[PDB]
Design a protein around this ligand. Structure first.
Ligand SMILES: Nc1ncnc2c1ncn2[C@@H]1O[C@H](COP(=O)(O)OP(=O)(O)O)[C@@H](O)[C@H]1O
Ligand SMILES: [Mg+2]
Length: 218
């Protein structure tokens, strides 16, 4: 009468965020900040880290790469849907990884980061406080993370920073890796511009050891 029923189509589970993470998300989504572009660097850094994980695993067991051995990153603007997406074919996240690493496990630097912000600290230091992912809310009102790890099924994590996130699964599903889609806020449409993205990618990617392909629309 669940996943095994002939008529089953999918399931969505709702989770609350760890208290400080919720506080941080409310702070980020509502704050005024004049250098919001740093969100892109955080997305690319996470893609790179995920590619490193599978790359090193592949040195002992090449079979982990399956049919996608060429590790790379894609940046996908979508003017029609008002979304910016960052895709990788890195290690991917299991259902547990999504629930644990994206909202429920406490990050020791969460409190210190919010305290730093009030004291005149730099929002660009977000990554150094171990909460880089949440910078997406500087430019987006909704974030959708689709991920597939070799040891699990594909799942979709989603949140509009309202105190909860969802985890969605379907019987059929996404190759290994992660796709992070940001639904941009009304005044953040510049991150859909090819020129703005090309320069921003070049700005914080001389150190990234993977090809970063900017997908052109129209
Ligand atoms: N593209 C991705 N692929 C795999 N795991 C990811 C990805 N993006 C984020 N994560 C996970 O979310 C966690 C939190 O990301 P972040 O807030 O940037 O912290 P950090 O990179 O310092 O660990 C990461 O540690 C990782 O487990
Ligand atoms: Mg990171």
């Amino acid at each position: 009468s669940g996943r095994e029923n002939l008529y089953f189509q999918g399931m969505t589970e709702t989770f609350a965020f760890q208290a400080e993470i919720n506080q941080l998300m409310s702070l980020i989504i509502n704050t005024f900040y004049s250098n919001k572009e740093i969100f892109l660097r955080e997305l690319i850094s996470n893609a790179s880290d995920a590619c490193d994980k599978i790359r090193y695993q592949s040195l002992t067991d090449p079979s982990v790469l399956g049919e996608s051995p060429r590790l790379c990153i894609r940046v996908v603007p979508d003017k029609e849907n008002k979304t910016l997406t960052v895709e990788d074919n890195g290690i991917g996240m299991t259902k547990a990884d999504l629930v644990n690493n994206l909202g429920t496990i406490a990050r020791s630097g969460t409190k210190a980061f919010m305290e730093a912000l009030e004291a005149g600290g730099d929002m660009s230091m977000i990554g150094q406080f171990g909460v880089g992912f949440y910078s997406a809310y500087l430019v987006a009102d909704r974030v959708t993370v689709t991920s597939k790890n070799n040891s699990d099924e594909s799942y979709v994590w989603e949140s509009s920073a309202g105190g909860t996130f969802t985890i969605t699964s379907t019987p059929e599903s996404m190759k290994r890796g992660t796709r992070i889609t940001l639904h941009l806020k009304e005044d953040q449409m510049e991150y859909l511009e090819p020129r703005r993205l090309k320069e921003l990618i070049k700005k914080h990617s001389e150190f990234i050891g993977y090809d970063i392909e900017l997908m052109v629309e129209k």
